[PDB]
Design a protein around this ligand. Structure first.
Ligand code: NA
Ligand code: NA
Length: 327
DNA sequence: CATTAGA
DNA sequence: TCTAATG
């Protein structure tokens, strides 16, 4: 956590570079397994060799540690940090829509700056044009203050459109968090659960609403179960316009909300724990159900859930508020 | 790890 | 169809 840090930290620098700038899926994969195990390791790595004894710990990497352990840095680490090209790839990646594959393609073309992206707005597909559009707004954080008014609106429509609709803004926001990165509404409805052959509209209906009224400005993507957009709070009585925010809405079977909702709330850690705990208490939990364990090694059979509670009671825990889903 | 774009 | 990109 702090004894192995620079080491794991430098490791991940390396990894993330292999995978992004280069297409070394493997090396990249290498640095990370290492970056992992050395992290577990309870003692201060004193040298290459000491490390080397570790699993996934090669000589290539061990070599890396010496230099790092010896001089406060790393040449390649220094060498990569500089490189406009790799530098350039690191940045374009930031534009919503741009992954590395594209990132690289763009570069080779000689698109390295934000402006390049501009002059060549033509080479970008919708997602990316939008990304490019709201570059400042997507990188900006979401105040709970705003989070509150936001949430406020999305509920009223939902409600207004149909009243049988259940919404839930999961995420950090849901867990207290003074700020969030993007709003995430969970969506269900009774007429939609597991077997019932869809009702895409269910999704569509709302998106229409939210748009109708001007909350959803743009669309990144809309499927019959996952809509991926952009929102905006009605700039009051002028002077103050609101930032463009990422909003994502997804349809769920009534019969799988709670686990799902459980899930999306986190924290990434609480889930595990909770998830690790269920294991003992005779269960399994995942993004959708909770199936009682059978000694033969494994087992199925989705137990029924009507609230966050059910999942809880099931595995025999204390209902932990979202506020407290911290870990 | 799954859903959507797009080519 | 595959292949990227997001969460
Ligand atoms: Na991006
Ligand atoms: Na292949």
């Amino acid at each position: 956590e702090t004894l192995n840090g620079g080491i794991t930290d430098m490791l991940t620098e390396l990894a993330n570079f292999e995978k992004n700038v280069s297409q070394a899926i493997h090396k990249y994969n290498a640095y990370r397994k290492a970056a992992s195990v050395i992290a577990k390791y309870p003692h201060k790595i004193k040298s290459g060799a000491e490390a080397k004894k570790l699993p996934g710990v090669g000589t290539k990497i061990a070599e890396k540690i010496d230099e790092f352990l010896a001089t406060g840095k790393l040449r390649k680490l220094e060498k990569i940090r500089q490189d406009d090209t790799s530098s350039s790839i690191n940045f374009l990646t930031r534009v919503s829509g741009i992954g590395p594959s594209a990132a690289r393609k763009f570069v080779d073309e000689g698109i390295k700056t934000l402006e390049d992206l501009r002059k060549n707005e033509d080479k970008l597909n919708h997602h990316q044009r939008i990304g490019l559009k709201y570059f400042g707004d997507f990188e900006k954080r979401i105040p709970r203050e705003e989070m509150l008014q936001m949430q406020d609106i999305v509920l009223n429509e939902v409600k207004k459109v149909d009243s049988e609709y259940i919404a839930t803004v999961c995420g950090s926001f849901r867990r207290g968090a003074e700020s969030s990165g993007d709003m995430d509404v969970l969506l269900t409805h009774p007429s939609f659960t597991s077997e019932s052959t869809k009702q895409p509209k269910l999704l569509h209906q709302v998106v229409e609403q939210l748009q109708k009224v001007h909350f959803i400005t743009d669309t990144l993507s809309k499927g019959e179960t996952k809509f991926m957009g952009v929102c905006q709070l009605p700039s009051k009585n002028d002077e103050k316009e609101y930032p463009h925010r990422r909003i994502d809405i997804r349809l769920i079977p009534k019969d799988q909300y709670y686990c799902g909702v459980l899930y999306f709330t986190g924290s990434d850690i609480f889930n595990k724990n909770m998830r690790a705990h269920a294991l003992e208490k005779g269960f399994t939990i995942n993004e959708y159900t909770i199936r009682p364990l059978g000694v033969t090694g494994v087992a199925g059979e989705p137990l029924p859930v009507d609230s966050e509670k059910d999942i809880f009671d099931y595995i025999q825990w204390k209902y932990r508020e979202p506020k407290d889903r911290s870990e």
